[PDB]
Design a protein around this ligand. Structure first.
Ligand code: QP2
Ligand code: CL
Lengths: 242, 242
């Protein structure tokens, strides 16, 4: 594919003193727009955005039994009170229940995990660093361009997984719905390797058009985290995606 | 499962001077409640709620290719301006584009439509009145209890159709996404036989519970139509669900 710089987008980043990139593609990833050619292809830890491939692989390997799977809490202490409860797949995504996804990865195992990430062309495809933490502090890395390519394949049911499993994950990623406007999206925040990276990736359907998007930025402190959503939203609104 | 009458929910009807029924079922306990057992079993034209089985049968039969199909507007005037445009499958369901679904029903044909409504146990299964209007002014009738049974079967993929097609229709029905819950739903308004009936049917997923719902009411005039959503929302708010 082909990626074209929109210089007018930078004002959005400089105004807040952000180093970041936004990639946005209408209809397909054949042709994408960005504020920064270089950074659009730079690879970073996925952090919780990896919950998207992880869920697909969990379903594809039968570790997650089906769409109605309940991840049962055994009652032993977890790090966050929001995690101390039985969860659905969507629930685990909404509360960012890392430990649920860790147990999924352990059950998938390194051999199967490595195979699906290569079939999915998922970032640098490197799962070194321990089966439960490679996407949090190991060697895996992916770019904003690669995230849009991956999400486009998921939208099209073109990943190397059943259509049923791709539909199941897609439903769990819906974050906004209206009669002719539907958003699928996912945040991430990588804090374990410097610089810290904030993500927001997804796609938007508006009438009969679709737009795939991925945003990342350097995160100085937690107070900057809302810009992950507000900068990309402002740019998308500038394209009439409202 | 079970059903119990709960006449307290009558507060909301008597306030608004409405004759109608709500049926709300908790999946895990297999238990339903209703303000009115008799009306819960009365059977009415499904009107636009028929878009749910019709979409499923459309896909099952190959009439609808998949969830990416776009139904193009041919430029002829439509009963609602909001219909005068190309629509996706989700968009055609959510704006209730009757002309789109009449065309689907024509291509499905009488033999196939009958076969499916029998498999789905859908209301009285009577498709007399003409293959493109039987659900709007013909002989077809369904009760609130029947609607919740049907929606539970869809949820569980137990309809006689592929899991893939059931899932496609499930995502098309999403109407509200919140952190704590996801609502799938569909409105209807039956105007071609008196008295006029307003419907709202669907389900709410919250925590690891699922609640199926069906609401209908006599509509005295267009100005009452919001009550189709507002009375059931108020009850579900009282019940701590949404
Ligand atoms: C739980 C943690 O290990 C991460 C994970 O891998 O899921 C969490 N994932 C995310 C995320 O955004 O997806 C986070 S952000 C952190 C918890 N939620 C807060 C949201 N901050 C704000 N202000 O932007 O809403 C701050 C956490 C770091
Ligand atoms: Cl950890």
């Amino acid at each position: 594919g082909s990626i074209t710089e929109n210089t007018s987008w930078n004002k959005e980043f400089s105004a807040e003193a952000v180093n970041g990139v936004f990639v946005l593609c209408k209809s397909s990833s054949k042709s994408c727009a960005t504020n920064d050619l270089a950074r659009a292809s730079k690879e970073y830890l996925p952090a919780s955005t990896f919950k998207i491939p992880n869920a697909i692989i969990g379903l594809e390997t039968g570790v997650i039994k089906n769409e109605h799977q309940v991840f049962k809490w055994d009652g032993k202490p977890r790090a966050m009170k929001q995690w101390e409860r039985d969860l659905t797949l969507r629930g685990a995504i909404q509360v960012s229940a890392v430990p649920v996804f860790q147990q999924i990865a352990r059950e998938v195992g390194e051999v199967r995990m490595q195979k699906y990430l290569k079939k999915f062309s998922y970032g640098n495809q490197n799962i070194s660093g321990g089966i439960d933490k490679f996407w949090l502090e190991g060697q895996l890395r992916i770019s904003a361009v690669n995230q849009v390519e991956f999400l486009e394949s998921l939208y099209l049911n073109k990943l190397s997984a059943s259509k049923e499993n791709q539909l199941i994950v897609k439903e769990a990623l819906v974050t906004e719905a209206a009669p002719e406007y539907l958003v699928h999206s996912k945040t991430g925040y990588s804090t374990r390797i410097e610089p810290k990276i904030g993500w927001w990736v997804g796609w938007v359907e508006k009438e009969t058009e679709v737009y795939f998007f991925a945003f990342n930025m350097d995160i100085d402190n937690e107070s900057k985290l809302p810009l992950r959503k507000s900068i990309p939203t402002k740019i998308m609104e500038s394209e009439g995606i409202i």
